[PDB]
A paper describes a structure:
The resulting ChAs were named according to a scheme whereby fHbpV1.1:PorA151/P1.16 denotes [name] V1.1 with VR2 P1.16 inserted in the place of [name] residue 151. We determined the atomic structures of ChAs with VR2 P1.16 inserted into position 151, 294, or 309, all of which generated [name]-dependent SBA titres. These structures were solved using molecular replacement to resolutions of 2.9 Å for fHbpV1.4:PorA151/P1.16, 3.7 Å for fHbpV1.1:PorA294/P1.16 and 2.6 Å for fHbpV1.4:PorA309/P1.16. All ChA scaffolds align with good agreement (route-mean-square deviations (RMSDs) range between 0.447 and 0.614) to [name] V1.1, demonstrating that the [name] scaffold is not perturbed by insertion of VR2 P1.16. In each structure VR2 P1.16 adopts a β-turn conformation that extends away from the [name] scaffold. In ChAs, the VR2 N- and C-termini are effectively locked into a 'biological' β-turn peptide mimic by neighbouring [name] β-strands, as confirmed by our atomic structures. We constructed five different ChAs, in which a VR2 peptide was inserted into position 151 in V1.4 or position 158 in V3.45. SBA titres were detected with antisera raised against fHbpV1.1:PorA294/P1.16 when alum was used as the adjuvant, and with antisera raised against fHbpV1.1:PorA151/P1.16 (a low level of SBA from a single mouse), or fHbpV1.1:PorA309/P1.16 when MPLA was the adjuvant. However, significant IgG1 binding to [name] on the surface of H44/76Δ[name] was observed only with antisera raised against fHbpV1.1:PorA294/P1.16, fHbpV1.1:PorA117/P1.16, fHbpV1.1:PorA183/P1.16 or fHbpV1.1:PorA309/P1.16 with alum (p ≤ 0.01 by two-way ANOVA), and fHbpV1.1:PorA151/P1.16 or fHbpV1.1:PorA294/P1.16 with MPLA (p ≤ 0.0001 by two-way ANOVA).
Author numbering: 79 to 150, 150A, 150B, 150C, 150D, 150E, 150F, 150G, ...
Write the structure that this text describes.
């Protein structure tokens, strides 16, 4: 059971492929994100690293997550002394999903329950699926291969559905990429990832931002990042319109051998 190992054991260099993943978007400052699986539990803050090295590659590892913030209320004790009573306000709760590759990884949050209108401690059930962090060894835009084509194959996973097949292709001469998502339960999500050019972002990493097409029809967008010194992997997300509103999908692919 490498989930509890990911929750209790420290980092290791002889672990396979991607060792660590910094949790920045999954937890904000002053928040506590508690993950539990296989009878183990660990609390995470803002800079904290998740030991993805113990997780299996190319699969979606699942934890139970609860997101809390701590408040110290002011009370008067037996005497007239000030006593602070710490109370943990549960902000969110659900399933925490992690997809691990060799040079990249991403987390997704399946919110099952949140606080209520005007709060007051009551939890209401409201589902949401969003992407957390997308981290790894970003490929430099200025160190991309000068030519050749590359076929990345991988997984597209959304709410209650992790069987999506992602297929992306990058021509490094034209510096362009395009792909498709297949075999998802929801038919409106099996979309084409339209051709768009490779761009450098603010830190000059290699990223691709294109349109999501459903029967040659624009119904959202997708963002991918290139990871690995030799552009081994891609990882990102997609926002797709459906009859049930907008859905979010996690994307992660790698070249094969
Ligand atoms: Cl008094
Ligand atoms: Cl949703």
């Amino acid at each position: 059971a490498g989930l509890a190992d990911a929750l209790t054991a420290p980092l290791d260099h002889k672990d396979k492929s991607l060792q660590s993943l910094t949790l920045d978007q999954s937890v904000r400052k002053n928040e506590k994100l508690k993950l539990a699986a296989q009878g183990a539990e660990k609390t995470y803050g803002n800079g904290d690293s998740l030991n993805t090295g113990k997780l299996k590659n190319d699969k979606v590892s699942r934890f139970d997550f609860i997101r809390q913030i701590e408040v110290d209320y002011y009370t008067k004790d037996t005497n007239n002394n000030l006593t602070l009573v710490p109370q943990l306000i549960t902000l969110e709760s659900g399933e925490f999903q992690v997809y691990k590759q060799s040079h990249s990884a991403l987390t997704a949050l399946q919110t099952e329950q949140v606080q209520d209108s005007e709060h007051s401690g009551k939890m209401v059930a409201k589902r949401q699926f969003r992407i957390g962090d997308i981290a790894g060894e970003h490929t430099s835009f200025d160190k991309l291969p000068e030519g050749g084509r590359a076929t990345y194959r991988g997984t597209a996973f959304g709410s209650d559905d992790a069987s999506g097949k992602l297929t992306y292709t990058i021509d490094f001469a034209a510096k362009q990429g395009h792909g498709k998502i297949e075999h998802l339960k929801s038919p409106e999500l099996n979309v084409d990832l339209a051709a768009s050019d490779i761009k450098p972002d603010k830190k000059r990493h290699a990223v691709i931002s294109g349109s999501v097409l459903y029967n040659q029809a624009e119904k959202g967008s997708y963002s991918l990042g290139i990871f690995g010194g030799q552009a081994q992997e891609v990882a990102g997300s997609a926002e797709v319109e459906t009859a049930n509103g907008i859905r979010h999908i996690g994307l992660a692919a790698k070249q094969l051998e």
